[model samples]
Target: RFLKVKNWETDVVLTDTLHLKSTLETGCTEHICMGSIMLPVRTKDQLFPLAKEFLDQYYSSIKRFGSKAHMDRLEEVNKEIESTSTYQLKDTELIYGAKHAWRNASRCVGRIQWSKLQVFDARDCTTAHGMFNYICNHVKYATNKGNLRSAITIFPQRTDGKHDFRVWNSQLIRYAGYKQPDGSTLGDPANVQFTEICIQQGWKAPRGRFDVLPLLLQANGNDPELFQIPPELVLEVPIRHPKFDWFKDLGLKWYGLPAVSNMLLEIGGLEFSACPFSGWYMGTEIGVRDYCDNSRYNILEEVAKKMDLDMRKTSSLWKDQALVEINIAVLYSFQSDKVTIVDHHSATESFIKHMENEYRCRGGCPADWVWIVPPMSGSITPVFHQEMLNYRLTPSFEYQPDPWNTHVWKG
Candidate 1:
C-alpha cells in the first residue's frame, strides 16, 4: 500500500510476482490510513457481473472453464436473476465457494488448510428452529470431542432486500458477561452487551466466567430466538501450565472451538448471511487476546503476580513473561489434553509457507498485516516483517450489521 523500493539485497523477499502492471489500489490517502480496517462496499446492481465472475472462476477451478455445463449455468443464473431477483448456488458450488472465501480471507493465517474446510449446506431451512438444530450439529462436528475440525454450516442467503437468515452471536460459543451491582463485569467483558440482550430475551445469565452463551437465531427477518447450546457438545479445555502446579488452581477454562458466527459470506455476488464457521484455535487468540486484553479477561497482572515477577517495574518485562506462560499453558493444556492448538511461531511459519503457495497459484495474495501478526510476539514472528497488499476480492467474508439494529425485524 506504500511507495518504497525494497533493497532486495538482504533475506527480505518480494511477493509481487514480478509485475508489469500495477495491482488493485489499496484504500489509503497520502496522509490518511484506511488500510488498518476491513475492506467494504457493494450493491444489487453489481450482483450479476460478480456472479458471472465467480461462476467463471469456479468452473475454471474444476478444469471446466468453457464446458457446456458451465456456459449453460451462467445463462441460467442470469435468467434467474432477471425474474427471481436472485440466483441459487448448487450445493457443490456452495461448498467450493465457502472454501474459496476462507482462502481469500486476508486476515486469516490458517489458509494452509483452506481446501479441507467442510461446508454444511442448511439453505433448505426456512425457520429459525431449523437453523438452531443445524447449528447444534455444526458445533458437534466442529468440536469433534476436542480434536476440532474446520467446518461451516451455511444457512439461507439473503434472497430479498429485507428478509434474511442471521446468526446474531459474534461467535457460536462465547462466555456470558453479566453486569455486577458495582458497575463491573463478571465473565468476558467483550460479550456483556450481547449477554444483556440474551437476558432481555428471556435467557438466564448464569454469571459464571465460562458459562456458554445461547444461540440467537433469526430467519426471514423475524426477531431472533434464543437457543441454548447443548452442554455436552460444547467442548472446553481447562487452562493449566505445564511446569507450574499452582496454575491449575486458577480455575480458568476456555471453549475448544473457535467458531465465528456473525460475518457474512459473499460468493459470486450473492450473500450467505447466516453462515457459522469454525476452525482450530491459535494459542495467541486464547492466551493473549481473550485472556489478556484489558477489555477481556485481563489476567496478565494476576498471573505475573503469581509468578512472583516484579509488577512495579516495567523493566522486569512482567507482561511479556506472563504472556509467554499463558501462551505456553494455552498450548500445553490443549495439546496434553488431546486438543488442537498452534503456537505463534509455528502458526506464522506455516503462514509463510501458505504465502509462497498463494503467490505461485495466484498472481498476488491479499493480506492484512495487522490481523495476521500474532498478538503475543510481533517482531520475533516470521510474519512481522512481511510486506503485504490488502484488497477486497469476491467470495470473501464481510461484516454485517448487528441483528438488533434493523427496524423491520423487531418492530
Candidate 2:
C-alpha cells in the first residue's frame, strides 16, 4: 500500500553540516537561521523575468502600429532598468552592520542579510518565460561591536518619502561563473572561472515611458486557449454611470479603478471556482492564514463538520477554489500597504480576510467563501525587468529558496 502524505514537513538543511564542521554548529537546531538573520531585497536578475511575464500575460497589442519608435521606447526603458536599480549594500552600511551585529549577537558576529525572496516571471514579446524579482525586506539586522543587532539602531536611518521603495532596493550578491582560457590574454573567451556579481544597485525600476510594451494578454485567463475576456468576468462597468456615487460606495474607485480592475481580471485566470472544497481556501483555521502548512488539517477537520461534508470532500473543493481566490487577491493587493480580509461566518464571529472585499461573481458565488492569496500563491506574473543576452533584448530571472522557514530552493 502507498503511504499517503496527509501531513508533511520538509527536512532542514544545516548550514554547518558534519561535512562543513561540528563546532560551527553554534548550539542551534533547525531554528538557527530561522530564529535570527534575514536577507531582504531581490537582485535585479530576479525581478525582470517575472515582471515581463506579467506584462505579456495581461496586455495585448500596444497602442501604436508597433512602429520603430515603439521599439525605441522599449529599448529606453530596458536601459533605465539596467541603470537605475539601486539595491546594492553600500560599503559604509555593510561595514557598520557587520561590525555591530558581531558585537551584540550571542556568540555570533556579522550582519545576516535578511531577504524576503520569491521567484516570478516577466515574459517578453518573443519569449513566453518571464523574470523573477525579490520583494523588500520587512526587517533588518546589522552587526555592531561584533554582535548582531537591529540595523535601525546601529546605522543612520534614511527617512524619505519612498523609504519602502528604497528598502526594496537593497539586494545581496549571488555568484555566477564565466568560462575563460587557462592563460588567455583578454577577450579570448576560453578560460574564465567564477563570475561573481557585486551589483551596485541590484534592482530594476518599474515601468516608465515604455510601460505599455510590458503589458500582454493572459494565456491563463478565462479563455486559456485565446486572448478574450472571460464571460463570467464580462460584467461591465458603465463608462458614465447614472449612480456613480452609489456604485463607487459598492467598493469601486475612479481614476485608478480601471487599472485595478484590469489587474484583477488578469489574475482570476477565468478558471472554474472550487468552493465546496474547503481545505485550500476556507482552510482549517477560523481566521488565520496558513499558506501551505500541513498543520491546517488539524483546523480543517473541525471546519468540515460545520460545512456539512467529509474532510476529504471539503478540502478538495477548498484547494481548487482557492487557486483563483488566493492568487487574484494577492495580485490585486501588491500596490497597497496592507490588506484586510474578514470572514462572514466561522466557529467564531471572526472572518478570515486577507484585505478588501471578495466576490465569486461567476456561475455562482459562495456565501462564506474566505480566501487568503499570499504573495507566492498567485497565478498571474507581474513583469518588471528586461534582459540583455549578448546585447540582445531578452528576459532573465533567478529563483531564491525560502531560507530558514518553509520551503527552500532545492539547490
Candidate 3:
C-alpha cells in the first residue's frame, strides 16, 4: 500500500530508508497522527559536516556544482568553520537559503509559493532596538497594505553562545488573552501564557478582546525588553457576513500578517534563533483554528445559536452549519477588504500540484499529512487521501526551546 518514489538521477531512495514507521503514542480515538515527531537537535560538534553537506546541496541546486565559485567557497567555509567554529553567509546565500528552507518546510501546504520569498538579512543586528525596527520594516513590506506577500527577516545567528537573538512571541502578531476573575479568558486563550509574560515585563495589559500584544525582544542573553508595535503597522480585518447582517454583531477581527516570529532557521548547520517569517493566512487557519479551537476564541456555539440551530441534537449538524458560515464569513470579509487569503480547497489543490513538481525534481517531498490537510473538513480535502512521506530535511524551519526557558543556555 506504500509507494516508494526513487531519485533515479542521484541513485538514491533516501525516503524509503528514512521512513521508519512512527511508533509514538498519539492518544486519540483514531490515533492517526497529524504531524511528525520533532527533529533531533543539532550538536555543536556536527557543525562543519552539516555546513559542507548543505553547501553541496545548494551548489547542486543552483546547477553550479564543481564550478570554481562553488569549489572555492566550499573550501573557504571549511576554513572558517575550522578556525571560528562558525561562519557567515553572503546576503545572496542567506536569501537563497531562506527560500530553500521554506521549500523544505514539511508542515507548510503553501510551498508552491516558496521561491517568491523576500528575505531581509539583519545579521548585523546587536541590540533589541534594531530588531524592533527591522520587524517594523518587514511587516510593512510583507503587509503591502493588506495585499500580503511572503517574507522573512533574519536576525544574527547564535554567536559563540553568549547571546541568542529571540522574539518571545510565537508569532509577530497575536491577540492578547486576559484571564478574568470569573475563570473566563477574554481573548485568544492560546496566548494567555505569553500575555502574562508581557504583563510581568511591564506591558500595560489592555482589556479589549482583540488587542495586539507587544513584542518581547531578547538580544545578547539580556532580559527581554517590551516594544509596543505601532498600531498603524498592523492591518486588521473586521469580520462580517455577506448575507447575514447580524453576523457583524460578533465583532471579531484578525491581523492580516501571520508572521511566525520565533522558529529556528537552520541553514546548513548554522542556526538563526530569531527569524520571523510572514505569509498571508489561509481562511481555515483564522476561521477554524484560531476562532473555533476550544482554547482560542471558541465562538462556534454562539455563532450556531445565533443561526437558531437546535443545539440539543448533535445530528442536527448545527456545529457544521456554523463552521461553514464562519469560514464563509472569513473568506468574504477578507476578500471584501481586498486582503490576501486562500481558502482550503485552493490551497490544497496548489500543494498537490507543487508535490508533483517536487517529486520530479528531487524524487521526494517532505510533508506531514496532519498539517498539510486542513483541520476542518479534512477527510474530504485532496491531501487527506494522498500519502505523504515525512522526515527531516536540511535548510528548514524548526521549533526551538523557548529562549526564556533556557536563556543562558551553555553561554
lDDT of 1 by residue, 153-253 (tens): 98888876477889989999999987799988899999989999999989987778888999999998788899998899988899999898899998999
Error of 2 at 124 (Å): 25
| lDDT, each prediction | 0.84, 0.21, 0.84
Error of 2 at 67 (Å): 3.2
How displaced is residue 189 in candidate 2, in Å?
52
Compared with the true structure, the alpha-carbon lDDT of candidate 3 equals 0.84
- TM per prediction: 0.93, 0.18, 0.90
After best superposition, candidate 3 residue 266: deviation in angstroms? 0.3
- What's the residue-level lDDT of 128 in candidate 1? 87
Candidate 1 whole-model C-alpha lDDT, 0 to 1 = 0.84
Ranking by TM-score: 1, 3, 2
For model 1, the run of ten residues with the poorest summed lDDT: 1-10
Model 2 alpha-carbon drift over 4 Å, by segment: 1-60, 78-294, 297-399, 403-411
